[PDB]
């Protein structure tokens, strides 16, 4: 089975977080929800409190992972952007040609860590200016954008599409289709 | 401000749970995530662990609420269906002409507690047979169904629509529209 690392910081967007975790687990991916700050519960942007599976400190010793996922939430993404551990994980994932997936404000952590420059990317509309500072990416308004191993998406409303794109990349089109049907998507 | 009670049981569908909580909080609704079994963390269907705001035992003493929300998840809905506390809360909400909102397998708890008989309802497709046992409701395949004070919806993929229908019912069309735009919905 393929493995996913989802990095969960205070202020993460809980919808951004939970939809990909749940959909990936439906696809038979082994998902580790790793707390940036440790194994304690994390207070998300809209006050949902999620207990991580592990600390990031521990989960990073159990890699490598087939995908590293960066949820959104403006203040969660800020925390991701400021973390040396996140920098190291992303650099190592990029160097081994592993998938990196980020949604909403999450892609701005790619900018902070100098990951995937030159890629076509999307973000939440309100995160475009931050992402584009310095012109290091080319912007897209597609709901999901994938340029090689950099997969990005826009917001809570695009999170199913994002999650299913991760599933397709790791486990193929047929598994994505199978997982999609019972979700009752429009 | 309007107030929402979201009843969280082991085996609840975490997407079903978190999307309505988050969207309602975006709408300025005061949401209480109440643990059916107590204030301890709840293991959802796809293993996301959510810490409730309160036990149901405590939250039911702080009502009444403008909406009672029943998430899905087949095994969460079973727990809701088996709870005397849930029966009492729903009966009292129905008697005071308060909104009751249920998604996915969640509406089957309405059947268990004899709530809203004669209403037009939807469920997840796989929950239709259970919901329809005895012919006490009329079935719909609409993504969101509202018949007076019984609001139902189908699955994770309809959870934004469900949540925005709750917002519209409590806080009006304009607030729902305002909350919807930043979600990046299709």
UniProtKB/Swiss-Prot annotation, chains A, B:
One of its GO terms (cellular component) is PML body. Changing residue 164 to P: In PARK7; strongly decreases enzymatic activity; reduces protein stability and leads to increased degradation; ubiquitinated by PRKN leading to its recognition by HDAC6 and targeting to aggresome where is degraded; interferes with homodimerization; abolishes interaction with PIAS2; reduced localization in lipid rafts; almost abolished detoxification activity on methylglyocal-adducted CoA. It is an enzyme of class 3 (hydrolase). The keyword Cytoplasm applies. Deglycase activity does not require glutathione as a cofactor, however, glycated glutathione constitutes a PARK7 substrate. Its EC number is 3.1.2.-, 3.5.1.-, 3.5.1.124. It is a lipid-anchor. It is linked to Parkinson disease 7: A neurodegenerative disorder characterized by resting tremor, postural tremor, bradykinesia, muscular rigidity, anxiety and psychotic episodes. PARK7 has onset before 40 years, slow progression and initial good response to levodopa. Some patients may show traits reminiscent of amyotrophic lateral sclerosis-parkinsonism/dementia complex (Guam disease). This is Parkinson disease protein 7. It comes from Homo sapiens (Human). The gene is PARK7.
């Amino acid at each position: 089975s393929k493995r996913a690392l989802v990095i969960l910081a205070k202020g993460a967007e809980e919808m951004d977080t939970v939809i990909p975790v749940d959909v990936m687990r439906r696809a038979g991916i082994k998902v580790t929800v790793a707390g940036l700050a440790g194994k304690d519960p994390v207070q998300c942007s809209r006050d949902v409190v999620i207990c991580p599976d592990a600390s990031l400190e521990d989960a990073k010793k159990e890699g490598p992972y087939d995908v590293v996922v960066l949820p959104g939430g403006n203040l969660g993404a800020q925390n991701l952007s400021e973390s040396a551990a996140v920098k190291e994980i992303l650099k190592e994932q990029e160097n081994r040609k592993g998938l990196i997936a980020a949604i909403c404000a999450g892609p701005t952590a790619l900018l902070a860590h100098e990951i995937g420059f030159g890629s076509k990317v999307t973000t939440h509309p309100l995160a475009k200016d931050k992402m584009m500072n310095g012109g290091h990416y080319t912007y897209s308004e597609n709901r999901v954008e994938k340029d090689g191993l950099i997969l990005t998406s826009r917001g809570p409303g695009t999170s199913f599409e994002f999650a299913l794109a991760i599933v397709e990349a790791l486990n193929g089109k047929e598994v994505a289709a199978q997982v999609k049907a019972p979700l009752v998507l429009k």
